[PDB]
Amino acid sequence: HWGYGKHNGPEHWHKDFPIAKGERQSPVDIDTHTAKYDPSLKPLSVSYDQATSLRILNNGHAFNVEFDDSQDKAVLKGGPLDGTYRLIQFHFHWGSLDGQGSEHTVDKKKYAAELHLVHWNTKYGDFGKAVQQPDGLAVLGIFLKVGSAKPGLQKVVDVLDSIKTKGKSADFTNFDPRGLLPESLDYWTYPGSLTTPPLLECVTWIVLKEPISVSSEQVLKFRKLNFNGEGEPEELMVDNWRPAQPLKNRQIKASFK
Ligand SMILES: Nc1ccc(/N=N/c2ccc(S(N)(=O)=O)cc2)cc1
Ligand SMILES: [K+]
Ligand SMILES: [K+]
Ligand SMILES: [Zn+2]
């Protein structure tokens, strides 16, 4: 029954998930001055031309846009990655107010929200086997700030009314995640974890430096979602972010000078 509240939120997770206090937990604060440019990083390749979305789901902690990952399509490679990683889902974390909501921070700055595009390493055959591996996953993280609308986000916004409550899902085909990407692929990268239980330490994080802008109206619609199920007392789905965790024995690398 983990969640984001007082009695079940991030400070409680370690009881059921002791890895919460592990050596490579996420998210982290990205100290931009300490991050070092890495000339060993290969160009990052985001190839989403053939991405095939299937469905959108309110899982009671966020909403997931799911992809058919049965064929080699929507792939992430290059950068810090060895081999090819396949897109399985994306989701967001966001705040109750524009001043908070991101999981990663940049010199302690919190963005209004953060998009996570989740990929599994194809060497491991599927997502379930990949999460048993230290290099099983790559998550592409993208910050959201409130300003101009993101036109490519609107289709997601408009379907949220149909998945208000935990356990609701809806068909969501033909969504193009290319419409969610900023111009620049400049990034920071480090080894980390899932940011929700089970908090598994499988993730190569790739966090883009350039945020996307979304409108106040768009993020307000995220905030109308519910953590609770249909017929249950309303608890708005807001502040579904884990705070920054200790960096410990890690270096953050920059893809740019
Ligand atoms: N058994 C199991 C259950 C839930 C799992 N969740 N997958 C996740 C995928 C991505 C993230 S995140 N917020 O992108 O780090 C967090 C969790 C993964 C494995
Ligand atoms: K609450
Ligand atoms: K949940
Ligand atoms: Zn996430």
Other beta carbons within 10 angstroms of residue 248's beta carbon come to 10
Structure determination technique employed: X-ray
Cα–Cα dist 9/98, whole Å? 20
Cα–Cα dist 99/68, whole Å? 34
Backbone phi and psi for residue 217, each to the nearest 5 degrees, phi listed first? -60, -40
Residue given tokens 């379907």 in the structure block: 159
Give the strand pairing for 105-106 and 29-30. Answer: parallel
Quote the ligand 3 centre to 197 CA distance (angstroms).
9
Report CA 141 to chain centroid distance, whole Å: 5
Q: Which resolution in angstroms does this entry have? A: 1.1
Whether residue 197 has a cis bond before it, omega within 30° of 0: no
Is there a contact between 243 and 104 (Cβ–Cβ < 8 Å)? no
Cα–Cα dist 104/63, whole Å? 19
Ligand 1 and 245: CB distance under 6 A = no
**Is 208 exposed, middle or buried, given 0-12, 13-18 or 19+ CB atoms closer than 10 A?**
buried
Domains of the chain: 1-257 (3.10.200.10)
Ligand 1 and 194: CB distance under 6 A = yes
- b/e per residue, 54-79, with b = 16+ CB within 10 A? bbbbbebbbbbbbbebeeebbbbbbb
7 is annotated as an active-site residue: no
Report CA 117 to chain centroid distance, whole Å: 5
Give the strand pairing for 212-214 and 84-94. Answer: unpaired
Backbone phi and psi for residue 158, each to the nearest 5 degrees, phi listed first? -70, -20
Is there a contact between 38 and 254 (Cβ–Cβ < 8 Å)? yes
Three-state DSSP state, 157: helix
Residue given tokens 């620049």 in the structure block: 184
Cα–Cα dist 89/94, whole Å? 17
